Write an enzyme that holds these catalytic residues in place. Structure first.
Site, mmCIF file in Angstrom:
data_model
loop_
_atom_site.group_PDB
_atom_site.id
_atom_site.type_symbol
_atom_site.label_atom_id
_atom_site.label_comp_id
_atom_site.label_asym_id
_atom_site.label_seq_id
_atom_site.Cartn_x
_atom_site.Cartn_y
_atom_site.Cartn_z
ATOM 1 N N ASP A 14 14.223 -72.986 16.708
ATOM 2 C CA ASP A 14 14.059 -74.070 15.752
ATOM 3 C C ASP A 14 12.833 -74.913 16.066
ATOM 4 O O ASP A 14 12.699 -75.448 17.170
ATOM 5 C CB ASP A 14 15.289 -74.974 15.751
ATOM 6 C CG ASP A 14 15.412 -75.785 14.488
ATOM 7 O OD1 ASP A 14 14.637 -76.751 14.324
ATOM 8 O OD2 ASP A 14 16.300 -75.477 13.672
ATOM 9 N N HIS A 58 13.799 -69.811 3.827
ATOM 10 C CA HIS A 58 13.515 -71.163 4.289
ATOM 11 C C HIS A 58 12.042 -71.345 4.625
ATOM 12 O O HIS A 58 11.395 -72.288 4.147
ATOM 13 C CB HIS A 58 14.372 -71.466 5.508
ATOM 14 C CG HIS A 58 14.608 -72.921 5.724
ATOM 15 N ND1 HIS A 58 15.159 -73.731 4.757
ATOM 16 C CD2 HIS A 58 14.361 -73.715 6.788
ATOM 17 C CE1 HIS A 58 15.252 -74.963 5.222
ATOM 18 N NE2 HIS A 58 14.772 -74.980 6.449
HETATM 19 C C1 HEM Z 1 19.615 -77.219 7.061
HETATM 20 C C2 HEM Z 1 19.141 -77.442 8.280
HETATM 21 C C3 HEM Z 1 17.903 -76.788 8.725
HETATM 22 C C4 HEM Z 1 17.803 -75.827 9.670
HETATM 23 C C5 HEM Z 1 18.944 -75.236 10.440
HETATM 24 C C6 HEM Z 1 16.438 -75.488 9.784
HETATM 25 C C7 HEM Z 1 15.986 -74.514 10.669
HETATM 26 C C8 HEM Z 1 14.723 -73.983 10.561
HETATM 27 C C9 HEM Z 1 14.290 -72.814 11.194
HETATM 28 C C10 HEM Z 1 15.140 -71.951 12.085
HETATM 29 C C11 HEM Z 1 12.994 -72.619 10.852
HETATM 30 C C12 HEM Z 1 12.133 -71.475 11.302
HETATM 31 C C13 HEM Z 1 11.511 -71.756 12.666
HETATM 32 C C14 HEM Z 1 10.456 -72.810 12.510
HETATM 33 O O1 HEM Z 1 9.395 -72.522 11.916
HETATM 34 O O2 HEM Z 1 10.789 -74.007 12.595
HETATM 35 C C15 HEM Z 1 12.611 -73.673 10.002
HETATM 36 C C16 HEM Z 1 11.367 -73.830 9.447
HETATM 37 C C17 HEM Z 1 11.011 -74.996 8.794
HETATM 38 N N1 HEM Z 1 11.802 -76.004 8.423
HETATM 39 FE FE1 HEM Z 1 13.634 -76.112 8.718
HETATM 40 N N2 HEM Z 1 15.718 -76.230 8.947
HETATM 41 C C18 HEM Z 1 16.528 -77.039 8.258
HETATM 42 C C19 HEM Z 1 16.224 -77.970 7.275
HETATM 43 C C20 HEM Z 1 14.929 -78.353 6.998
HETATM 44 C C21 HEM Z 1 14.573 -79.426 6.187
HETATM 45 C C22 HEM Z 1 15.617 -80.284 5.518
HETATM 46 C C23 HEM Z 1 13.180 -79.476 6.172
HETATM 47 C C24 HEM Z 1 12.234 -80.382 5.499
HETATM 48 C C25 HEM Z 1 12.447 -81.026 4.358
HETATM 49 C C26 HEM Z 1 12.729 -78.413 6.990
HETATM 50 C C27 HEM Z 1 11.418 -78.123 7.248
HETATM 51 C C28 HEM Z 1 11.041 -76.914 7.819
HETATM 52 C C29 HEM Z 1 9.652 -76.469 7.789
HETATM 53 C C30 HEM Z 1 8.517 -77.250 7.185
HETATM 54 C C31 HEM Z 1 9.629 -75.264 8.389
HETATM 55 C C32 HEM Z 1 8.449 -74.367 8.659
HETATM 56 C C33 HEM Z 1 7.833 -73.693 7.439
HETATM 57 C C34 HEM Z 1 6.541 -73.089 7.919
HETATM 58 O O3 HEM Z 1 6.561 -72.422 8.972
HETATM 59 O O4 HEM Z 1 5.454 -73.579 7.550
HETATM 60 N N3 HEM Z 1 13.814 -77.757 7.470
HETATM 61 N N4 HEM Z 1 13.689 -74.494 9.839
#
Ligand code: HEM
Ligand code: HEM
Ligand code: HEM
Ligand code: HEM
Lengths: 309, 309, 309, 309
Positions: free
Chosen positions: D145, D218
């Site tokens: 994460d 996501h």
């Molecule tokens: C529901 C709960 C959430 C979980 C469990 C979660 C988990 C993750 C995971 C595992 C990744 C891929 C690894 C990484 O690149 O971080 C990710 C990517 C990301 N998450 Fe989340 N996330 C959640 C909610 C959110 C929310 C609410 C936002 C923003 C409004 C967000 C923003 C991002 C962004 C911007 C990325 C990366 C996209 C890219 O690589 O450019 N996430 N998230």
């Protein structure tokens, strides 16, 4: 001696559901056509008697207080609109329900053509669906639909009223609910997630393990246990319909039962939900559009109607 | 070597006609799905291959000038709206026609479900009819429909283009016309009057005597003699549809022909009429709602489309 | 004028595959029965001619050098055992192949009963499978099997030999491969993983998107492009068989082709694999048990066999 | 010269998030403790300075209009509750956010113990989570994460406000969202299905191929392209929490950004979704419980607060 209406029939490849409301002051016009229905069924469906044309006449509460005098069915009432936490089960006005079923679409269409024009000008057809049938009895969700309807004794005591109401010995109660579930979110949803929704498998329709099946699944919430230990079952002829020109993909739910308390407790397990699980997982995708509670009489009751009040 | 589209098929008990217009700037999206159609047909209809699922892809004039480069079919033009003396034959915009036919409704419904969602967002479905089939191939008028379609050599030279246009050897022209004829005046009309309308009998469909048959009958006006003495025939898969909730009882006319001059001369014999008989007797009851002229290509033409201009 | 054997037939609900090896010095005994086969087919299958009993006699390389004099089919050779990186495609000795197909099991059983006892003592039946057929032409994997067989011109030039070998104009080459794939790992595997295996969907058998479909999928590896741009297709009547008493769940693959180079390149794309993808994903679950290369002659060739050397 | 709050810090193995709402008429009591926070941080975290105790004080809209006079941050507003098609993103009232992070749980606990009892009776703590940290920075879903947080210049221009609002040069906007995703459906889901959910792999966290990655993933929906071509990134310190005694397994999302339009467009890409993909695949499993929009000031802003209105 009370011959029931043909509700104990197998699922047919085509079906027509008609919810027609009776116009004001047109009581005797429907009172003419109500003994004529079995005559029209035997008249039309005898052309190809191996199509099994079978009408199920049903009468709501308003049409009962208008059309019939004398007694009243004990639990016959207007369909209680279930305004749950998120999903609402509405109830459009509909006086009578014509449930038609046969092997092909044309003989159901012709029986419905002769049905409203035996009472021409007395009714307006509120709901018009031509329910067809998928490959191996599936619905538009992709799951095989209606595989837990009982047979024999466990079906006739599930549907037909005995002498707990002896003035209507034989006869059921109907809950129609025209759903219009979207396919955009359902198709993007993965299979296993959908088996979490239904509670059974998709391809072979094996029921899942009791620990593997979640509590908010459809097959988990709709089975009803009593306090003596017996389970109360209903018979449902759910037929899918749809119009791709509007993008509609719906399953016309219709449930026959001995008493509407059973069907209403199933709807309370779905919309209101369990006190642990307050939502049914299929209602995340299925939104009810119509709704109505009706009463099947016997065919003898249509043959010998009580006098018009 | 040019394999034609399955137009030379018997009438099926269920049919789905789709007239979908292509949205602006969505040319390549339909250009993706146009080779995929025979693949989807062989994919879906092989489940129960004894249902004979057969799609007939058709393309209008606007979709030809948008989608395809290179040549053009010689007589492909927008459907000439026939503003006769009393009856008018309108022409709604429709780019492509999907004609689906099989033994049951569900596999046509599933092929149409996969058809628009192979080109999702590129089209709006203008016309959505689910054509079912009456008892002995009848229509809603009560007469047996389509009994004079040819077979064999007199059918392949009636429909398939030879080398009079060698760039499209094999392929037809389609005239869809969704009628919505009333039954209130037709049912009150007597049988022998209706046999003056049609030109054949009603129960057994014997053609009437040549002196007994009136000049303004349907079978009298639609047969076309040439100057050499041969008669030009078309193949029509007219399937009845209808919705009793609106009181609609219509017959979806669809005619396949080698050249649209033949079908247009039949429509001129109907709407414009003969100079003796300026009206066809079935047009007293049938009012056309939609209309369109299309082109069937070969399935090789969908397999090898010309490059997108 | 050369009438081919009935290979261009639809898939039948029951099938019997017989791989019988000819005993030493029993050449003339099979030479008696080889013209008698079409007579036995017309004799038995005319009882219920709407069962479509059709035998496909096939002859391997050893039975060709023993039984027939004169010429030889150009690419007829013993089935090259493919010893790949992990999966091996064995080749048991089998002289002749009897491929039987009809609407029911009994008439195939009776034709096979009369087949070995027209040459009693001359053969030992090495492989005995009774191939039945699943719900909508599926196999035991659950996917609809054989939906990409061609039809018409693209099938007769796919199977029947023209005058590239004019001594055997009309006639195919057969690759039987009795698989015995396990269901313990396949059932625990999830659906979308299985669609990565196959390359098409499971319920509706839509082919996947070209970018979504992996390179080591079955439908990805088995389609063969030539250098001119045409694709070479074969016709396969793959029928599932199985014995639950041994826990066997197998799909009897049998592929008819104009030349065995096409089928062998498909097997090289599966077992040897692509130089990028050296394994086919269905071979992770399917292990071949038997194997053989045969030759269909014409029915005229069985009617007029060349003299026994 | 404006020193920002320690948001540009690595992820710590323990974290405490406090959403405390300010009681009515207790403005000056929090106005006492707000300059005391950095003093308490330097007081407590200097015991083991290699634990890196770092508080991030954040202030919502209501606490800004109550506590501070003079200017206002330009986009500071209450958190817009996103009522999407199926998933809803609620917004509980919370005035100030205390984000605490260090190498161990105890020093965060002691800083939070001294934080509310520096303003004793002025606040009620609405949300109390003790965010711990998984093996290799994973969450409860099993995926690593927060691996796409930027560093250096691409991080300080991603979070710190320049002179586009010169009265608050330096400072971020915070979106907390306490999720409570179920593990019963997620664990029964297979791995490759979960990689369609996330968009990256699970064990090694390689980003998937651009054609292989689905549109509703996501990592597919959360990357935001501008019209000039640059991408807007946020920094998120998402720490998992949970209580097995209630069966809770949640990931406390908290996102720091230069402007809340970026985070709100990410939330619109998740809940409202794309106009092609209207749902994010992780929201099938994750349901938001809380929500709030806050503002980080500089530490100089806590050192020199504007006078109390
Ligand atoms: C529901 C709960 C959430 C979980 C469990 C979660 C988990 C993750 C995971 C595992 C990744 C891929 C690894 C990484 O690149 O971080 C990710 C990517 C990301 N998450 Fe989340 N996330 C959640 C909610 C959110 C929310 C609410 C936002 C923003 C409004 C967000 C923003 C991002 C962004 C911007 C990325 C990366 C996209 C890219 O690589 O450019 N996430 N998230
Ligand atoms: C939203 C539309 C609905 C769909 C698509 C649907 C579909 C299904 C499916 C696929 C099953 C599993 C197969 C089978 O056992 O029938 C099922 C089970 C069942 N459904 Fe429905 N259903 C719907 C609504 C309802 C409603 C409104 C009721 C009654 C109030 C109901 C009563 C049942 C019952 C009683 C079962 C079987 C539970 C058990 O096996 O004992 N369904 N339904
Ligand atoms: C208004 C809707 C229509 C109905 C209900 C209808 C119905 C019928 C019926 C019942 C027949 C006699 C049975 C048979 O021979 O097919 C017939 C004949 C025919 N119809 Fe139609 N028809 C309609 C419109 C059209 C149109 C628009 C065309 C072509 C432009 C057409 C072409 C023909 C032809 C060519 C024949 C046969 C004449 C002959 O036997 O050679 N029909 N139609
Ligand atoms: C291991 C046992 C096998 C099974 C269970 C199997 C099953 C399938 C299935 C389910 C499909 C997709 C549906 C369809 O297009 O047919 C398929 C495609 C195909 N299979 Fe097989 N198959 C097997 C082995 C083979 C072998 C050994 C060959 C030939 C050497 C072969 C040739 C093909 C071809 C050519 C296609 C279609 C590719 C395309 O669509 O162009 N299969 N098979």
């Amino acid at each position: 001696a009370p011959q029931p209406q043909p509700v104990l029939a197998p699922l047919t490849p085509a079906a027509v559901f008609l919810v027609a409301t009776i116009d004001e002051g047109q009581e005797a016009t429907v009172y003419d056509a109500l003994p004529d229905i079995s005559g029209l069924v035997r008249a039309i469906g005898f052309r190809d008697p191996a199509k099994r044309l079978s009408a199920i006449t049903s009468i709501g509460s308003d049409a009962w207080d208008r059309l019939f005098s004398g007694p009243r069915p004990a639990e016959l009432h207007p369909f209680r609109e279930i305004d749950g936490g998120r999903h609402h089960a509405p109830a459009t006005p509909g006086d009578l329900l014509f449930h038609l079923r046969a092997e092909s679409m044309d003989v159901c269409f012709e029986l419905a053509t002769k049905l409203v024009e035996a009472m021409s000008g007395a009714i307006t057809i509120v709901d018009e669906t031509h329910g067809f049938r998928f490959f191996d009895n599936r619905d538009l969700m992709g799951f095989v639909d209606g595989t837990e309807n009982p047979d024999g004794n466990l079906a006739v005591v599930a549907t037909q009223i005995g002498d707990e109401d002896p003035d209507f010995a034989g006869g059921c109660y109907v809950h129609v609910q025209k759903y219009l579930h979207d396919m955009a979110s359902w198709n993007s949803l993965s299979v296993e997630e959908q088996e979490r929704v239904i509670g059974r498998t998709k391809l072979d329709d094996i029921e899942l393990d009791d620990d593997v099946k979640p509590a908010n699944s459809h097959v988990a919430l709709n089975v009803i246990e009593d306090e003596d230990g017996n389970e109360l079952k209903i018979i449902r002829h759910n037929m899918p319909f749809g119009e791709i020109g509007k993008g509609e993909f719906g399953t016309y739910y219709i449930g026959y039962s001995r008493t509407p308390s059973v069907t209403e407790r199933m709807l309370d397990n779905m919309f209101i939900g369990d006190p642990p699980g307050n939502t049914d997982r299929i209602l995340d995708f299925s939104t009810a559009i119509t709704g109505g509670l009706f009463f099947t009489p016997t065919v003898d009751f249509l043959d010998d109607p009580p006098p018009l009040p």
